[PDB]
Amino acid sequence: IKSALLVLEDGTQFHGRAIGATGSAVGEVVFNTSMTGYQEILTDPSYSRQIVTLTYPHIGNVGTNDADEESSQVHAQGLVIRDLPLIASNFRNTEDLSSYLKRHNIVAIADIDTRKLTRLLREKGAQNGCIIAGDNPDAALALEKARAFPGLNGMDLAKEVTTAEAYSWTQGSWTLTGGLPEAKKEDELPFHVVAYDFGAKRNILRMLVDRGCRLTIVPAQTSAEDVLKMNPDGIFLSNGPGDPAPCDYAITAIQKFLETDIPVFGISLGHQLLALASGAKTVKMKFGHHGGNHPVKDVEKNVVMITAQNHGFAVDEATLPANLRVTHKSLFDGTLQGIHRTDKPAFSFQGHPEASPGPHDAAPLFDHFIELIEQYRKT
Amino acid sequence: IKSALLVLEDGTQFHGRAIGATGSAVGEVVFNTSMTGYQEILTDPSYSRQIVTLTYPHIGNVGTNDADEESSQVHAQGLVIRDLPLIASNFRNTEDLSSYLKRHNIVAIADIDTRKLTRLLREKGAQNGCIIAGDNPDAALALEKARAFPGLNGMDLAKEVTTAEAYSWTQGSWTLTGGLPEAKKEDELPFHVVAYDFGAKRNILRMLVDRGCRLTIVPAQTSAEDVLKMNPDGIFLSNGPGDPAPCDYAITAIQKFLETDIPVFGISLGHQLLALASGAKTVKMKFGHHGGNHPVKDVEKNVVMITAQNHGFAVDEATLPANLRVTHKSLFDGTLQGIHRTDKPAFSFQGHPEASPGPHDAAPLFDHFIELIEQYRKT
Amino acid sequence: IPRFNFEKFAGANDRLTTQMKSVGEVMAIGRTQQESLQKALRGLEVGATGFDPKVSLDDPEALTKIRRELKDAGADRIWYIADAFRAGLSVDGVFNLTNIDRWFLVQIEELVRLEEKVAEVGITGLNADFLRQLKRKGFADARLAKLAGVREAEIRKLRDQYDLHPVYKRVDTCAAEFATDTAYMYSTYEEECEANPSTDREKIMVLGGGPNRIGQGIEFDYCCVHASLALREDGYETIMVNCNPETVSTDYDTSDRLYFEPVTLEDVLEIVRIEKPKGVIVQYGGQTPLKLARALEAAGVPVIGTSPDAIDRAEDRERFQHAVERLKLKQPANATVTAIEMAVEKAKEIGYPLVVRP
Amino acid sequence: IPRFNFEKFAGANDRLTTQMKSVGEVMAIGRTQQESLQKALRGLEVGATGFDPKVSLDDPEALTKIRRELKDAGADRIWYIADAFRAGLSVDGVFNLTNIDRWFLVQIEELVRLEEKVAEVGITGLNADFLRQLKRKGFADARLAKLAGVREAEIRKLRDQYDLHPVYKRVDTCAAEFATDTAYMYSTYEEECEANPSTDREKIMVLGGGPNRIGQGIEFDYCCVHASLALREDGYETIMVNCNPETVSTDYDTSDRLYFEPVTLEDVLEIVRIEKPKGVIVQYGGQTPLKLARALEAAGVPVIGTSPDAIDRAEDRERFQHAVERLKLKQPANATVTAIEMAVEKAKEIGYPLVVRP
Ligand SMILES: [Cl-]
Ligand SMILES: [Cl-]
Ligand SMILES: [K+]
Ligand SMILES: [K+]
């Protein structure tokens, strides 16, 4: 028997089984409704300092594989599931879930009433928590760690996950027949895009490359000056964990770019930063959006897209400056999903056009971007 | 494929597979002929800084168990085997060998020509080596580390494995039916023996206890004074790793006890320390004695006993002071196996009377000790 | 799980193929596949209690039959698969014959292994922890009773003792991301209960008939629905218990509270335990609920309408003749025989042609 | 491994018990148990090349036959164990029936799985690494050939290409702790070879008969021994090839060099390959070496004494009939009959009674 326990700030305990490393994990607890895509989820940088609870009962059914990593490592601070299946069963599998977890030194627990947890998180809002996997997990200890956590609100996590030094990215999307491609050549991709790494997911990269974008991925804290010096066809604001509000350096640099006529595109956090740079305000949501079935309306076009979401914060629509128009809203709660600068070649999306995991419905958001960068090149 | 590689000081390379921890291991390479007993071997402190090679191809058939541990940890620097069985098959098993190695953080290699290795050591003598277990074992690197190894000659290892502080031991021997018995009450043990911890195997303690001895284990560097103050019925000199020669402290103390009438008994290392303390000379053998089938003749009685041996150094027989009488010799090589002080109630044996693992043939060595003790108390 | 009726078509080819041959289906919800699957088996109304064995372990020939049943699926395959694991076959062996993905197979093997431990440790070994792990895997009290060598009611009583009951979760389309004001539930052995029964209403529970089979069709479902609609409209709080996915009785709009569960004594009782209904109807859903009447009644359940006794009186060949005899009505000449030579003489008595009912 | 002769005792109870029924035994040495076991199988002189199959994968009754063979051991149990694994029985399933320790069973199972891969990848999949791997596990070139559907010679050749030959270790009583002046060797696939063949002496190889069986007793071994003693006394360097543990021929004293190996084409050619003897004697060990005569010569082995062709002239009835004829010698009237009626007529010709040798 390998004991594990989850304790929330509120005192609520979940007694289960250890399926990952032995030790402790502490951070904000969230729920994700994705019935598939767990690996991608664990490897998403946006989950930094978050203990992830999957609502779908059987997690790990298809094992794990490299292609399915959205970043170099597992960013989830912990993993909460109802059941770890006996085996992984899928041709693509290269290592079963538990092993992968232990491998990445992740603290995870199974066998708990994930439905109760979700209902609690939904009803009462996000909570900080702690998982203790070990011989005799100390509930009291877990509880203090939980209470001592400072909270993600006001926490700049981007600076913690970005890259040290800048780099090039020229690799395309994976395919069933070929798998992950080979890195293109720089002379093979017409456009040059500078991508701010706020903890960016690989797929976003792969998908830009697919659109003919040679990428330069820089550290979050890179100056506009230092960027402009690269004469980019366009600038891309990645996705990332924590609060966007405390990322002064980015809001500022963006502010800069907004003075220029260079094409700017943000996803999630980037979306929020872009808004910040336009003078809008951000709020932390009650429990946020995490799943891959969220309907988002393209207000302009009156159409619905089923999307991929992973965000704890949002842009306040009522604080929105005249120079920002609303492009999309959530069909689930009315929250702001996309915006465009009236005056500038700048726009962003709250969800993830690159999915991975999730529906591909929002991939077109990428095209708008290209169009811009193209029109920006005619000039 | 999880590669592992072993390289000897001489450049000789053995390519095999990783069966333990990822990493490297440097030490003196020895070969051990024991067909059974691999766990007890590994847990023998006398193996400190030595990479152990087992000549019997299938190592791990019976898994592992806690009663088969000769100390609190795995002392072997590394393990070199021909084959790791698919399964452990014994009612006493609690954990498969590989899992056990991983847990003890031992670098191990399997699938190599152990006979080749053995013949090399025999013919050309002990050699230092390095085992590298990982993704791309660098042979030049291994070769480097091996070469850089200092060597066990003149190296005092006793001080490194010795217990930090003293302690009491009153536990006896395991039985099939009862397993490892509960430790005895001090009042239950007639004698009190003080034991120098030069890297003592638990079975020595266990077997002395079986004989009515309550024990007090002391650090290798404990002073005679501090020792005499305890009023010991007898003094026992444990087995241990490295060169006995550099152990001036022990030799000095031992000399102090010999001026007395207290019974003294050493095993292996303690046997050499006694010899030194009496003015004898110790040497480092070509390859040593490691195995459990070694014939040893008791020259007084003219009988042979099959024994367990674990030694890289020996006491020269031609340098023996007149006060030391020869009681036993190896039948394999005529090397010195036992000595008894002609003037003092002090004696010792080069092999392991406590076996563990091995033939029980030499157990009676202990008996003599007891006798000495009983008669020392009669005064 | 599909419901078949090959016994009624003795000369028919009973191997499953691309042309359907099932006559109905049962559905089940569980928090784990193991749970969902076992629940479905016990709701199937074929007399199964979970993976009841088909062959005996000591049949020299058992393996031949198992091989055949696995390679060329009939309606009983699910059972042969468990027989296979009890017989020493591996997951891969089963995989090879069936092509059923091993993800499902390992789960069935696990259940057999557990059944083996239950048979082994017996009732005495049915400690709370073990008992709870079993329920969590979907084990029916009745399956456990068979394994332990006891009566189903013994297991039940034990659960009662350990205060081991299921909880009810709700179907909500969104994995709990949004609240629901609908009462469409299923049982599970978990922590939080979402049943939240009213204390308000006079409740009427209607029991459905599980999967449709020949003779037990939509006609019964239609009555069940009518009862629900009529009483609700009269102001009662209606509770439907059924597990046929194809019908109107299982549409959430049909009743105030829907329990998507196997129509078994065990499942029904757990519902009654917390709902405390004013009355339960067992005469509308056909043979399924009817066969449950005596036991429900014995367990304290408030059965309404025609009493189980009165039902038994008509259905009992003897009791009945007795009553017909009693009212001074005509019924054909009849007799009970045991032996062949017995029949032959009795037949003589009764007069051909004859109606020989088993 | 014991050698039986049940085929010579039709009405006999052929199940193994406490009373011995075996008529001989073979012995094998390997660095590993798998290698050891497999070499013994090929050394048994029963036609096996290792784990040859006994039942068809397509046999519907296969598991039932396997089971009986397992549960009630006969001489072929060993092969049936491998069949069980191919049929889908688990190690625990096999254990339960045979009581053979799982430690051995897992190894046999692993060898089966290796065979399935060979079959799947065919000769094409037989890269150096894989082949080496297979050889290290004791697979005979003959077994691999059957699996990859090629001739044995094709596998051998492939080994030659890859420079994949076994090495020889010596027996020494002490696990290499002390050196040996004796050359008692066995083959294995490893790194260091201890053969160190002489360039000094002219050598003569004597092939033994393997395990004893009815008809192939100690008589043939007595001969092998005398050939060795005599030639050695005569000054030749005598090399014995045999694997019968009960014989004087396998006593290290009997010859200059002893290879304790299966007497097979594969094993012999490897020896020859490195010893390069002046001559090889195939006429002293019984049928075993007698049958390798042609293939040995065909591979350029220096066979002495009566030629392999000569042997065949005597062994082939037909070839023999001509010789007799040419010799104007008397022999019973005979005739090959295909069909039954062809037989009843021919028979008339020959006259009764008749000696029907198939
Ligand atoms: Cl829980
Ligand atoms: Cl090697
Ligand atoms: K739990
Ligand atoms: K190797």
We report the CATH number of the domain holding residue D217 as 3.40.50.20
- With contact defined as 3+ CB pairs under 8 Å, the chains touching B are D
Distance CA A184, CA A77 (A): 34
CATH 3.50.30.20 maps onto chain A at 1-150
Are the C-beta atoms of B46 and B199 separated by less than 8 Å? Answer: yes
Distance CA B350, CA B308 (A): 10
D192–B115 CB contact, under 8 Å? yes
Note whether D125 and D214 are same-domain residues: no
Q: Which domain holds residue D149?
A: 46-195
- The DSSP bridge pattern shows strands B191-197 and B234-237 to be parallel
C32–A82 CB contact, under 8 Å? yes
Note whether C187 and C234 are same-domain residues: no
SS (H, E, C) B69-116: CCCCCCCECEEECCECCCCCCCCCCCECHHHHHHHCCCEEEECCCHHH
Note whether C219 and C115 are same-domain residues: no
C90–D88 CB contact, under 8 Å? yes
Which residues, including other chains, have CB under 8 Å from residue A16's CB and lie 6 or more apart?
A4, A5, A6, A109, A110, A111, A112
Angstrom distances, CA of residue D335 to CA of D207, D317, D324: 35, 11, 15
Residue type, A299: V
Between C62-71 and C91-98, two packed helices, what is the crossing angle to 10 degrees?
50
Residue type, B13: Q
- Chain centroid to Cα A16, Å, comes to 27
Note whether D156 and D81 are same-domain residues: yes
Q: How crowded is residue D341: how many other Cβ atoms within 10 Å of its Cβ?
A: 9
| Residue linked to tokens 């109606």 | C355
Q: Give contacts of C100 with chain A, Cβ < 8 Å.
A: none
Angstrom distances, CA of residue D247 to CA of A142, D25, D220, D228: 73, 11, 11, 13
C106–A87 CB contact, under 8 Å? yes
Q: Where does B151-379 sit in CATH, by number?
A: 3.40.50.880
Are the C-beta atoms of A239 and A352 separated by less than 8 Å? Answer: yes
Note whether C190 and C63 are same-domain residues: yes
Token pair for residue C117?
């431990």
Distance CA A62, CA A136 (A): 31
Distance CA D240, CA D275 (A): 12
Of D31, D102, D177, the CB nearest to B82: D31
Is D86 annotated for ligand binding?
Answer: no
Cis preceding linkage at D353, omega within 30: yes
Q: Give contacts of B57 with chain D, Cβ < 8 Å.
A: 31-32
Token pair for residue C346?
């009795």
A89–C110 CB contact, under 8 Å? no
**C66 at interface of D, judged by CB pairs closer than 8 A:** yes
Distance CA B172, CA B182 (A): 8
Distance CA A174, CA C78 (A): 38
Of C110, C169, C178, the CB nearest to A115: C169
Ligand at minimal distance from the CA of C191 is 1
| Residue linked to tokens 């080069």 | B350
Provide the edge-to-edge strand list for the sheet that holds A264-267.
A167-169, A213-219, A191-197, A234-237, A264-267, A346-349, A336-341, A324-330, A282-298, A303-315
Q: Give contacts of A89 with chain C, Cβ < 8 Å.
A: 101-103
Q: What angle do CA A76, A79, A82 make, to 5 degrees?
A: 155
- Shortest CA gap D178–chain B (Å): 7
D190–B116 CB contact, under 8 Å? yes
Token pair for residue B190?
């007639």
- What is the 8-class DSSP label of residue D50? S
Q: Is C11 helix (H, G, I), strand (E, B) or coil?
A: coil
Choose the mutation target among C90, C105, C116 for the interface with D, i.e. most D CBs under 10 Å: C90
Distance CA D122, CA D142 (A): 14
- Chain centroid to Cα B23, Å, comes to 25
Element (H, E) at B215: strand B213-219
| Residue linked to tokens 């030595």 | B50
Method: X-ray
B86–D110 CB contact, under 8 Å? yes
Among A269, A167, A271, A171, which Cα is nearest to A218's?
A: A167
| Centroid of ligand 4 to alpha carbon of B14 (angstroms) | 7
Note whether C121 and C206 are same-domain residues: no
Which residues, including other chains, have CB under 8 Å from residue C130's CB and lie 6 or more apart?
C121
**C65 at interface of D, judged by CB pairs closer than 8 A:** no
Q: Say which CATH architecture domain A1-150 belongs to.
A: 3-Layer(bba) Sandwich (3.50)
- Shortest CA gap C193–chain A (Å): 9
Token pair for residue C15?
């191997």
How buried is residue B206: exposed, middle or buried, by Cβ count under 10 Å (0-12/13-18/19+)?
A: buried
* CB environment C28-58: b (16+ within 10 A), e (fewer): bbbbbbbbbbbbbbbbbbbebbbbbbbbeee
Distance CA C18, CA C9 (A): 18
Of B83, B119, B293, the CB nearest to D32: B83
Q: Give contacts of B115 with chain D, Cβ < 8 Å.
A: 31, 169, 175-176, 190, 192
Q: Give contacts of A56 with chain C, Cβ < 8 Å.
A: 175
| Centroid of ligand 2 to alpha carbon of B5 (angstroms) | 9
| Residue linked to tokens 């191809």 | B57
Distance CA A153, CA A49 (A): 12
Note whether D95 and D219 are same-domain residues: no
A296-303 long-range contacts (CB < 8 A, ≥24 apart) are: A296/A328, A296/A329, A296/A330, A296/A331, A296/A337, A296/A338, A296/A350, A296/A351, A296/A362, A297/A328, A297/A329, A297/A330, A297/A331, A297/A337, A298/A327, A298/A328, A298/A338, A299/A326, A299/A327, A299/A328, A299/A329, A300/A327
Are the C-beta atoms of B42 and B12 separated by less than 8 Å? Answer: no
Reported resolution, Å: 2.0
**C94 at interface of D, judged by CB pairs closer than 8 A:** yes
Residue type, C146: K
D60–C64 CB contact, under 8 Å? yes
Note whether D213 and D273 are same-domain residues: yes
Choose the mutation target among C105, C177, C189, C192 for the interface with A, i.e. most A CBs under 10 Å: C177
Q: Give contacts of A82 with chain C, Cβ < 8 Å.
A: 31-32
CATH 3.40.50.880 maps onto chain A at 151-379
Ion ligand 1 — residues with CB < 5 Å: A 14, 112-113; C 191
Q: Is C352 helix (H, G, I), strand (E, B) or coil?
A: coil
Among B31, B60, B73, B36, which Cα is nearest to B310's?
A: B31
A86–C32 CB contact, under 8 Å? no
Note whether C180 and C202 are same-domain residues: no
Size of interface A-C (CB pairs under 8 A): 55
Provide the edge-to-edge strand list for the sheet that holds D203-207.
D167-170, D184-188, D257-259, D237-241, D203-207, D279-281
Token pair for residue A268?
């999630």
**D61 at interface of C, judged by CB pairs closer than 8 A:** yes
Note whether C82 and C100 are same-domain residues: yes
- What is the 8-class DSSP label of residue B162? S
Distance CA C67, CA D63 (A): 8
Q: Is C186 helix (H, G, I), strand (E, B) or coil?
A: strand
